[PDB]
Amino acid sequence: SVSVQTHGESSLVNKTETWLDSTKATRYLMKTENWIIRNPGYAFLAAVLGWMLGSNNGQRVVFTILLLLVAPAY
Amino acid sequence: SVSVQTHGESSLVNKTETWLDSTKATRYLMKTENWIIRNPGYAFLAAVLGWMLGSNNGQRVVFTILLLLVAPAY
Amino acid sequence: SVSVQTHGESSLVNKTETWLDSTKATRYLMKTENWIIRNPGYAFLAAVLGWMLGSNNGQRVVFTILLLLVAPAY
Amino acid sequence: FNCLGMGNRDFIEGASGATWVDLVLEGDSCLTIMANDKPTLDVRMINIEASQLAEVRSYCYHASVTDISTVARCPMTGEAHNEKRADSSYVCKQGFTDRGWGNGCGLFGKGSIDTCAKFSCTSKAIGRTIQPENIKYEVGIFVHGTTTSENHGNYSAQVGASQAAKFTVTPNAPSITLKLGDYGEVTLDCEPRSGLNTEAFYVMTVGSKSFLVHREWFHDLALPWTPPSSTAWRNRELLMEFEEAHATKQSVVALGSQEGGLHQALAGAIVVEYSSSVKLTSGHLKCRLKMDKLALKGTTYGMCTGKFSFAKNPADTGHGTVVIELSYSGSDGPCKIPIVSVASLNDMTPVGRLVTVNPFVATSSANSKVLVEMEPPFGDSYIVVGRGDKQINHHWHKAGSTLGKAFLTTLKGAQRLAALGDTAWDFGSIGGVFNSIGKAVHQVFGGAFRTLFGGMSWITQGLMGALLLWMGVNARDRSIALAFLATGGVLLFLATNVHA
Amino acid sequence: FNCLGMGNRDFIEGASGATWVDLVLEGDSCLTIMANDKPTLDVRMINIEASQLAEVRSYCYHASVTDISTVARCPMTGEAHNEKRADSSYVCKQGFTDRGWGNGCGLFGKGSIDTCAKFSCTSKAIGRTIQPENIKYEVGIFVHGTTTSENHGNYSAQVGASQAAKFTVTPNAPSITLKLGDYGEVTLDCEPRSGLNTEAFYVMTVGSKSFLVHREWFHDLALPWTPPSSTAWRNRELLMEFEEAHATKQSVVALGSQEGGLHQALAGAIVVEYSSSVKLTSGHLKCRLKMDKLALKGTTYGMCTGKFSFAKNPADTGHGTVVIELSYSGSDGPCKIPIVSVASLNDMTPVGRLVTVNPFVATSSANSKVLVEMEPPFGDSYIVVGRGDKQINHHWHKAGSTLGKAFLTTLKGAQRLAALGDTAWDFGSIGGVFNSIGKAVHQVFGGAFRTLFGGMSWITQGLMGALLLWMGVNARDRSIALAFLATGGVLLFLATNVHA
Amino acid sequence: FNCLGMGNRDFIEGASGATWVDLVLEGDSCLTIMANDKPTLDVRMINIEASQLAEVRSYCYHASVTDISTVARCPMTGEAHNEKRADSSYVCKQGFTDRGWGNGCGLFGKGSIDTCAKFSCTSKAIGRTIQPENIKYEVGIFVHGTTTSENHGNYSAQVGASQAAKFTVTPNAPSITLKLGDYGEVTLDCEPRSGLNTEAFYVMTVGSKSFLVHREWFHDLALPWTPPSSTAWRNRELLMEFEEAHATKQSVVALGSQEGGLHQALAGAIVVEYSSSVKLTSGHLKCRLKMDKLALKGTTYGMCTGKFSFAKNPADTGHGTVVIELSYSGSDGPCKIPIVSVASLNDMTPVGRLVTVNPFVATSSANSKVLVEMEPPFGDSYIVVGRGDKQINHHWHKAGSTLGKAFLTTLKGAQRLAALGDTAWDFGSIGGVFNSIGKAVHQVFGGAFRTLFGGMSWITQGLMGALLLWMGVNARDRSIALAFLATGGVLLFLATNVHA
């Protein structure tokens, strides 16, 4: 909407300053952090489930740190 | 913003009709679909990488169908 | 339509003669026969494929005689 | 209104133990009850009259199409827009045609055209609905007294004879008692709510004739439909065709009338008579009947004193009984009319039973005629026309030997079991134990399963059995019967039930 | 204010053993209690009125930007400083642009420019808060006496009838007794502190309409905000844009109004009516109700002496009960109105129960009408109106067979479990053992866990189950159920709870 | 229009072997070519002017809603129909509300209501498109002759000096030769078709400011849109809200203006200037340049006879070169101006090269000033001004030691590789073997792959590398490099390219 599916960014040609760059680089981190800072309990039980399955070590972490991005913005 | 981190939804008490419900249920699907319908090439190479790693079958799919949600809305 | 999805038949209560019964009993056979009498070549290669698979005998025939109804009316 | 001569006629063996017993009657059939000390009663549906109707939705099965117009646009100029979109009286369709310099435009390969046309109904279909409080039942009821050949079928007389009566029942007046005079009065207890589901389906009218159809099926119909009154429709394209767009010029054409397909479509629908109201033919109705005040007049009268005669010759009912007509010379009337049913003239011991108990001479007028029926037993017999020398008698065969009759009854029972559902156990009147549970069993059993995959048509379910059979054919012991019950029965029989 | 016709209506089976029983009521729903020897009671929320409000912080969702000014400096001359930094009425931003001899300066490649502009609000947002001592509850209460079609929904009459009353409750007056007159008086015991957390969230107003919003969420709004009254703001850049610095000339531009996004943003917010005060729709409130002084007037009166009549025809409540209206010819009023609910006319034994016990003729005036409801049982039945030949009766179906009730009961509970949390056990009134612990169990269980990872939205938690499921799918015995409880339930159900 | 002082400035080392060499220029940057026997040339974009525009579709981002009306119906009366459906000027929505006797109707639980309201645009958005034949390019071109501090940046003079010229190029006039006078004439060969895809996207205007936006993305905007001119819209609900239907009374409300979200939405869009036409800032344009008729005037003149002077002091370009200004006392002009770039005063052997070959005294007028640039080499050196005792000299550092140049060269290429795609190989002018294939390689390689999963945003693709890396981290030999090329590069670098 007016919200989601921002054209940002076309980003062709253009050596210059884009409409809002400073916002854009900062956007994706915050709105996720704000939510995760909120309900950390989520991450706790989340992280556990990663260590549960696959037992190959690091690839387990691959689930978790990934999964932590899932809950933000569904 | 005015866009992201919608209070939607408080959703306490309230047996009644919420401000906009009809929108809300429909929102999350479309703005993702619109984007994925757009660049299907993404999903192709995406799906392959899932089958690449972990070789436990279905848990490989767990990555993919998950991963397909990642690219929408970063 | 006016053609397909005939209400025929409600058929509740009614000890009496229905709107058109004589047609109805005769309908389903003919319009299939007419078509199968037409292109028998269909049935030939059709019947073979049944004997091809499953090799349990009669259950193979189950496919065929069934399958012969499929092609009529798609 | 009598049970005479109706193609489908059944009797009821009074079990005593009550003046009340439960009944279910049908449009065509007529029911006849014989129970000791009680006369013989006739009840049959007349019709089902519903009064006031409401109109759910509509359909236009044949429509007109006029006022073709289209507006082209050059390529890259986007969608065209015809003003006529401003009115629901048109259907607009966009379109596009490839474009040369030779025609009108400065780039090649595409375009836009907007076709619109007016839309109007040739002739339309009307659905209607029924509100249960508008239901009626016309039921005539009859008892066998003195009758002639003429008066018998006729309702005028028996009113005076007070041996028959008509009445209406509604959920507003769910039960009534009504006087036959001399024999006393009787009591009907019915359940108008249960006759139909007035909300199971709709009244539909197409042109003249009209039809009962399922409510769910009506919504699906693929065709222009309308809000209840009202104005203008949905999906109103499907009667129209767009040709190949040709430059500026495209034509749109209406299909031929679909009216036939409707008639084609309707099969299970049941003909009805619709002007202001509707009259069903086949009703399905449960009732209870209370006989206490019913008694026997005439027990006073003695034997009749004079010769008898046969106006009409003995003849068969086809239901297994026999009627005759008698005229009587003497003037001693009213007098009790001696007759019986016997094996050989060497015996006076009756065997069969009178259809009408105690034939009753109406009047003292000579050469009156009397209409009387009995049920002789199997094989050969005689009809003794009163004792005394003057006794005359006739010799009337019947071939019906008990096993054949029993077998026929079983087939009839199966049909009754089918299409009458749970309620079919009501023939088992004054139930409990066997009968009460038999309706309880069939209740969830038939109310599910057979009706759950229901919606099958002839071979659809008809085929299934054979396919099911092979499962029963090849299976494991104690798995067989479980599967077999699915295979045979419940399916093939109704498949045979429909012959035709 | 009555329970008539409200879309959501439930009953309560009086367990006796007390004149008191515990209740929880809701904005939409209306509650109805039947307990022996006691009339039938109606209680429902009216609204929630809060009085005085306080203003935490503010927001300007749409702002104006004017008075662009900028001051360049040569390279190596450090940061520029515009005087306008001396006032909070501006936003200053530094900047720099590469520099030639051709423009103004004696070295190449860099510079300094200081851009400032005035900042002002197009139109702004106001948050507000609620102090619990400002809460109210308007609760009407009602008992079923003599009513007509008209007066029934109307509050004017029943005041005179004294069969209904409205009142306010506060933490200042947490419980009240109030007189219905003849039936006695009853006692409500509630807990205004528990209705909401007045501090759980804020009242927010955007333009006209206003909204309840988690004060939690409400802080992290990204937009100009203000100290409570006051003057001038923080983070007031985010409505402005700086272009590419061009020599001396750079422009700054305001974004378009954000007002939409707010409306977009708000979803779970609940519409409210804000001028001086607020009126909620859906309340959540616990109460206890004490019935001792409630009694039954009318036990004096005898059977009514005259014909009955149906003003309105029987009709369904949709909640599983049936109301009708009666008018009465005779003048004997006040008199006790005979009626029951029966199986067949062969029996006078009632089966169902009266919604309103002892219908009561109001007055001696002829042709008054009386409004009465009952609950027939499943299947078919009759409504006996009066005794003796006068007795008229109507035949009213119901299809509701017990099992489907048992289910629609359960899920309805299940729904009423969800979103009503621990308190949902209050339907289990006069608890202990089972019910008391069931609230104790859910207490820490729901007060954690489900609410700890709470903040999920639809698929967010909705997806989780399937992902969880695969864990339950592939796991070890006795580990399965532990994981499975996480997988299914608590999650998928509320995911189904929202359909829609 | 000159290359002086532009933030981004690059040079080109003439390989001889042709009077022609291929170039690509950009909006911001300015290009400078030094090749033997040939003067030094300056070319830079001015702007991109497009002339005539066309309007694809429209949007109304903020709308008005008035004329609420609704028509109820009793339950079972089907859908309601409001007449206003007869006009596209309204949006109609059906609806239904539960119904009591208390309000208006003879059955309970349901109903029908038809809500309609008029719909109108507060203010709307306009898209537009560009037809390639409407493109232009303003390109100024410049050669270094006699200049002062003033005239240099100024276009008025150099016209008279004939050392600079402006011109337009179109697909209609794809190449032009143009005379500088004394130095001869030169030839530009460009490809206007290739500058942009005029059909890659649209011109969009929102309120005042306007934007370039992928026509692709531009369709899926969710909002009321319109046929190109025209009248009335599609999907025009999404600015409206329907409240809870309340009896007859329901309200519908417009959302706040969405204008902000648009501005929010647009990021990658590029500001443009739209009134009648548009002026881009950043162009992307390929050209070839033919130098044959270019020659060197002044070879006649001899050494200048008099003292020199420094009007402005030496200063750095920031691109690695150094300009100074000289004024000259003597009257001998025009005369050839001796200068060089030297290591130590013990040597007269030049080392660096003149930016402008053969500084040229314009006139005989005393105390004229002359603007001249050179490129000294690394470390320390001197600037020899004149010969003989008159000779004065200045000592100008540079820290730039070669290696750091080699790097800042590379990455700059790497950046200039990215976002310049295949065409980036055009810096490799007069190609073949290496360069020609390097564009051929990148052609299908970049024209697929990187652009096939393209549409990634920052972390989206930015994250991928690390995830990819772990694959390269744990893999098999000879599978590693195949996977690793995917992991590193092509991805992380552009992820670093954006810093910011």
Residue E383 near residue E376, CB atoms below 8 Å: yes
**Alpha carbon distance E351, E204 (integer Å):** 54
Q: What are the tokens at E256?
A: 């378009």
Chain D: give the shortest CA distance to residue F197, in Å.
15
Count of C-beta atoms within a 10 Å radius of residue C42:
15
Cα Rg of chain E, angstroms: 33
Number of domains in chain B: 1
Place of tokens 């848990």: B59
Q: Do A34 and E260 lie within an 8 Å CB cutoff?
A: no
Q: Tell the CATH topology of D407-497.
A: Monooxygenase (1.20.1280)
Measured CA to CA, the distance from residue E149 to residue E154 in angstroms comes to: 9
**CA-to-CA dists, residue D238 to D44, D216, D233, D235, E491, angstroms:** 47, 21, 12, 7, 45
Cα of E155 to nearest chain D Cα, Å: 32
Q: How many helices (H) and strands (E) does chain C have?
A: 3, 0
Tell whether B11 is covered by a domain: no
Q: How far apart (Å, rounded) are the C-alpha atoms in residues D42 and D11?
A: 9
D197 vs D215: CA distance, rounded Å: 11
Beta bridge partners of E94: E114
CB contact under 8 A, E344 and D189: yes
In whole angstroms, what is the distance from residue D57 CA to residue A55 CA? 64
Q: Which of E314, E358, E496, E306 is nearest to E418 (CA)?
A: E496
Q: Note which residues in 201-240 of chain F have CB less than 8 A from chain B.
A: 216, 220, 222
Q: Are F143 and F163 in contact (CB under 8 A)?
A: yes
Chain centre distance of CA D326: 36
Residue C45 lies in a domain: yes
Q: Give SS3 for F94.
A: strand
For an interface test with E, give the residue of D190, D191, D289, D436 to mutate (most E CBs within 10 A).
D191
The tokens of D270 are what? 């049941």
**Structure tokens that stand for F244 in this block:** 């809870």
Nearest CA in chain F to D73: F228
Between CA F135 and CA F137 the distance in angstroms is 7
Question: Would you tell me how many other CB atoms lie within 10 Å of the CB of residue F216?
Answer: 15
Nearest CB partner across the interface for B1, out of E214, E261, E419: E261
Identity of the residue in E216, E460, E471 whose CB atom sits nearest the CB atom of A74: E460
Residue D220: in which H helix or E strand, if any? Answer: helix D215-220
A contact set with B (CB within 8 A): 1-5, 28, 31, 34-35, 53-54, 56, 59, 66, 69-70, 73-74
> How far is the C-alpha of D176 from the C-alpha of D191, rounded, in Å?
12
Is domain F308-394 classified as CATH 2.60.40.350? yes
User: How would DSSP label each residue in D138-168?
Assistant: EEEEEE--S--HHHHH-HHHHHHHTSEEEEE
In a domain, C10, yes or no: no
Find the closest chain D residue to C19 by CA distance. Answer: D267
Say yes or no for a CB contact (<8 Å) between F231 and D85. Answer: yes
Q: ∠ at Cα C39 (C33, C42), nearest 5°?
A: 100
Q: Is E9 on the interface with F (CB under 8 A)?
A: no
Angle value at C-alpha A40, between A36 and A43, nearest 5 degrees? 90
Query: The domain F61-124+234-257: what is its CATH number?
Result: 3.30.387.10
Which of these, F269, F135, F261, lies nearest to F202 by C-alpha position? F269
Chain A residues inside the 8 Å CB shell of F222: 1-2
Neighbours of D208 (CB within 10 A): 6
**Residue B42 is assigned to a structural domain of this protein:** yes
Q: Which helix (DSSP H) or strand (DSSP E) does residue A16 occupy?
A: none
Query: What residues contact residue D283 under an 8 Å CB cut-off, 6+ apart?
Result: C13, D25, D26, D27, D45, D47, D48, D137, D195
| The two three-digit tokens of residue B42, written as one number | 């993404």
How many helices and strands, by DSSP H and E, does chain F display? 9, 28
Please enumerate in sequence order all residues whose Cβ is within 8 A of that of E406, keeping only pairs 6 or more positions apart, or say none: none
Tell me how far CA of residue F351 lies from CA of F344, F347, F381, F396, in angstroms.
11, 10, 9, 14
Return the closest-CA partner of residue D203 out of D100, D328, D58. D58
| Among B2, B3, B4, the residue to mutate for chain A (most A Cβ within 10 A) | B4
Chain B residue closest to F241 (CA)?
B20
Residues of E in contact with A70 (CB under 8 A): 460, 463
The answer to whether position C5 is within a domain reads no
Q: With CB atoms and an 8 Å threshold, state whether E453 touches A42.
A: yes
The C-alpha of A23 sits at a distance from chain B's nearest C-alpha, in angstroms, of 11
Distance, in angstroms, between F325 CA and closest chain D CA?
57
Whether residue A66 is contained in a domain is answered as: yes
Q: Which amino acid type is present at position F305?
A: T
Q: D66: alpha, beta or left, given left = phi > 0 and alpha = psi -120 to 50?
A: beta
| F and E touching (3 or more beta-carbon pairs closer than 8 Å) | yes
Q: Where are the domains of chain F?
A: 9-52+133-196+279-290, 61-124+234-257, 308-394
Paired sense of beta strands E112-130 and E90-95, if any: antiparallel
For residue C36, tell me if it sits in a domain: yes
**E452 vs A contacts (CB less than 8 Å):** 39, 41-42
Q: Please, where are the H alpha helices in F348-479?
A: 402-417, 434-447, 459-473
For chain D, the straight-line distance linking the first and the last C-alpha, in angstroms and rounded, comes to 29
Distance CA E64, CA E240 (A): 9
CA distances to B16, F69, F96, F396 from F245, rounded to whole Å, are 11, 12, 7, 84
Cβ atoms of F225 and F215 closer than 8 Å? no
Give me the CATH code for the E9-51+132-196+279-290 domain, please. 2.60.98.10
CA torsion angle for D66, D67, D72, D78 (degrees, to 10)?
A: -80
Peptide bond into E273 cis (omega under 30): no
The answer to whether residue A28 is domain-embedded is yes
Give the CATH number of domain D61-125+233-257; options: 1.10.10.10, 3.40.50.300, 3.30.930.10, 3.30.387.10.
Answer: 3.30.387.10
The superfamily CATH assigns to domain F9-52+133-196+279-290 is Tick-borne Encephalitis virus Glycoprotein, domain 1 (2.60.98.10)
CATH top-level class of E59-125+232-257: alpha beta
Cβ contact A10–F261 (<8 Å): no
- Judged by DSSP in three states, E318 sits in coil
Task: Tell whether D305 lies on the interface with E, counting CB pairs under 8 A.
Answer: no
What is the token pair recorded at D84?
């006529």
Measured between CB atoms, does F77 come within 8 Å of chain D?
A: yes
Identify which of F437, F444, F446 has the alpha carbon closest to the alpha carbon of residue F417.
F446
Q: Which one-letter DSSP state was computed for residue F360?
A: B
Q: Searching chain B, which residue's CA lies closest to the CA of residue F468?
A: B49
Chain A CB within 8 Å of residue F7 CB = no
Range of the domain at B63: 28-70
